[PDB]
């Protein structure tokens, strides 16, 4: 029918939103404003309070200041994934080690399974992250969630994305990811496809990925040109290298970027949506590169204005929000479905 989910399409999902009613605080809708890293000492940038009128986004959610732990919001999000045809929810994971995290992960898996959506984990740069506690955490996540019907596998293996994987030396990664490594996961119950973050130039990233024994790489950033890896004119050559070296390239595409409510000094990274034309151009480049899998930045990174989740026009006494302009609130979901179709036609 051209409506089925695609299980090689990964959409980055954030579960860090709170409401006073459910979480005791409108978590993340309230957010600190970052000081300007070039702007000198004694800045008092303040905070966005997460009131109805003033939230930590340049856009405004159709669903309002929602809780990521509200089962009724989760239902709606899964129906949005079905509309977008995105079969894998790539869940931010911060190793909070608290009952609230454990509850929310279970609720997300349960809601996903009702709609045949799958869940994989996006392993964030949590405090003191290293290959030993990464192994322990991979073991824990596979043990706790690996038998859940919504847990993702690709050809029998779990898949993890590793954000800011460059913060760990290749010599450490080798211990975890080479078949001969001291603490290897290869050939164990806990083996997985490990997808590292390709940032800078090939002279740096090619030996990094090889020496670290990653199974593949992704690029994350929604803003074209932010890094070498997030410059789509490089994607044909990145794919050629991947294929020559037995690696899985999962380029990241997004609909735009803007984070100036929380980073007022970061305007150079703004990428305008142009009624969908930015998203179309980036998704076309991914497909043309001939890749096997695509990642989407993001479902709901509202702070960075990369979300495909529905947004609505809103002007409050405190801020005039951006919105989807000439397009309807669900335009980026239905346009994602269009591109998933073009991607499948290519596979």
Ligand X SMILES: OC[C@H]1CC=C[C@@H](O[C@H]2O[C@H](CO)[C@@H](O)[C@H](O)[C@H]2O)[C@@H]1O
Position 217 contacts ligand X (CB under 6 A): no
303 makes contact with ligand X (CB under 6 A): yes
- Which of 163, 235, 278, 314 forms a contact with ligand X (CB under 6 A)? 163
Which residue of 101, 113, 124, 280 would you call a contact of ligand X, by CB under 6 A? 124
Closest chain position to ligand X (CB): 303
Compute the C-alpha angle 158/163/167, nearest 5°.
Answer: 120
- Beta strands at 294-296 and 6-13: parallel, antiparallel or unpaired: parallel
Q: By the 8 A CB rule, do 123 and 134 touch?
A: yes
Q: Give the CA angle between residues 287, 123, 24 to the nearest 5°.
A: 115
Please identify which residue in 92, 230, 252, 336 interacts with ligand X, judged by CB under 6 A.
Answer: 92
Task: Name the one residue in this structure whose structure tokens are 């991914």.
Answer: 286
Question: What does DSSP assign to residue 18?
Answer: -
In angstroms, give the least distance from the CB of 341 to ligand X: 27
- 3-state secondary structure (DSSP) of residue 19: coil
* Residue position matching structure tokens 């293996």: 157
Cβ at position 267, least distance to ligand X in Å: 15
> Using CB under 6 A, which of the segments 81-89, 139-147, 176-184, 298-306 binds ligand X?
298-306
Please classify residue 17 by burial: count the beta carbons closer than 10 Å to its beta carbon, then call 0-12 exposed, 13-18 middle and 19+ buried. Answer: buried
According to DSSP, the residues that pair with 209 across neighbouring strands are none
Residue 227 touching ligand X (CB under 6 A): no
58 binds ligand X (CB under 6 A): no
d(CA 335, CA 329): 11
Which two structure tokens, joined as six digits, stand for 42?
């004694």
* Window of 43-51, 272-280, 301-309, 316-324 that interacts with ligand X by CB under 6 A: 301-309
Residue closer to ligand X (CB basis): 253 or 262: 262
Cα pseudo-dihedral 223, 229, 235, 241, rounded to 10: -170
Residue 104 or 303 with smaller CB distance to ligand X: 303
Q: Should residue 213 be labelled a site residue for ligand X when binding is judged by CB under 6 A? A: no
**Stretch 246-265: interaction string toward ligand X, x if CB under 6 A:** ----------------x---
By CB under 6 A, tell whether 17 contacts ligand X.
no
Query: Contacts with ligand X: how many residues (CB under 6 A)?
Result: 8
Query: Closest separation between CB of residue 27 and ligand X, Å?
Result: 10
Beta-bridged to residue 257, according to DSSP, are 271
Strands 30-32 and 159-162: unpaired
Q: Does 113 bind ligand X (CB under 6 A)?
A: no
Q: Does 174 bind ligand X (CB under 6 A)?
A: no
CB-facing half-sphere around the CA of 159: CA atoms within 13 A = 29
Backbone angles phi, psi at 17, to 5 degrees: -90, 140
- In the bound state with ligand X, the residue whose beta carbon lies nearer, of 113 and 124, is 124
Shortest distance, CB of residue 303 to ligand X, whole angstroms? 4
DSSP codes of every residue in 75-120 = HHHHHHHHHHTEEEEEEEE----SHHHHHHHHHHHHHHHHTT-EEE
Q: Which two tokens stand for residue 171?
A: 């010599």
Stretches 61-69, 73-81, 268-276, 296-304: which one binds ligand X (CB under 6 A)? 296-304
Residue from 58, 95, 295, 301 in contact with ligand X (CB under 6 A): 301
- Output the CA torsion sign for 320, 264, 59, 227: positive
6 binds ligand X (CB under 6 A): no
Q: Which stretch binds ligand X (CB under 6 A): 72-80, 211-219, 234-242, 300-308?
A: 300-308
Nearer to ligand X, 91 or 287 (CB): 91
Q: Which is nearer to ligand X, 32 or 236 (CB)?
A: 32
Residues that bind ligand X (CB under 6 A): 92, 122, 124, 163, 262, 301, 303-304
């Amino acid at each position: 029918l051209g409506t089925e989910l695609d299980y090689d399409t990964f959409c980055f999902y954030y579960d860090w939103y709170g409401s006073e009613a459910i979480d005791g605080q409108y978590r993340h809708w309230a957010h600190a404003i970052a000081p300007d890293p070039n702007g000198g000492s004694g800045q008092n940038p303040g905070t966005i309070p997460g009131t109805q009128e003033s939230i930590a986004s340049n856009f405004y959610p159709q669903l309002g200041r929602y809780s990521s732990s509200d089962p009724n919001i989760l239902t709606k999000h899964m129906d949005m994934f079905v509309m977008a045809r995105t079969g894998v929810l790539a869940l931010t994971w911060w190793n909070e080690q608290d009952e609230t995290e454990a509850k929310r992960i279970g609720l997300i898996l349960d809601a996903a399974d009702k709609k045949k959506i799958k869940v994989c984990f996006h392993l964030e740069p949590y405090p003191s992250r290293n290959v030993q506690n990464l192994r322990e955490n991979i073991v824990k996540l596979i043990t706790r969630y690996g038998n859940h019907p919504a847990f993702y596998r690709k050809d029998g293996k779990p898949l993890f994305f590793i954000y800011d994987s460059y913060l760990i030396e290749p010599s450490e990664w080798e211990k975890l990811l080479s078949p001969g490594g001291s603490i290897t996961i290869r050939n164990t119950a806990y083996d997985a496809l490990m997808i590292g973050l390709w940032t800078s130039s090939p002279t740096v990233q090619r030996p990094f990925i090889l020496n670290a024994h990653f199974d593949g790489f992704y690029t994350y950033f929604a803003a074209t040109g932010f890094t070498y890896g997030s410059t789509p004119t490089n994607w044909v050559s990145m794919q050629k290298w991947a294929k020559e070296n037995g690696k899985i390239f999962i380029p990241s595409v997004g609909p735009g970027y803007i984070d100036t409510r929380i980073r007022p000094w970061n305007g150079s990274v703004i990428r305008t949506r142009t009624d969908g034309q930015y998203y179309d151009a980036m998704y076309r480049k991914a497909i043309e590169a001939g890749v096997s899998a695509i990642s989407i930045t993001s479902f709901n990174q509202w702070h960075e204005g990369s979300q495909i989740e529905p947004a609505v026009p809103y002007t409050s006494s405190e801020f005039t929000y951006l919105d989807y302009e000439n397009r309807e609130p669900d335009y980026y979901l239905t346009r994602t479905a269009y591109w998933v179709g073009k991607f499948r036609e290519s596979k």
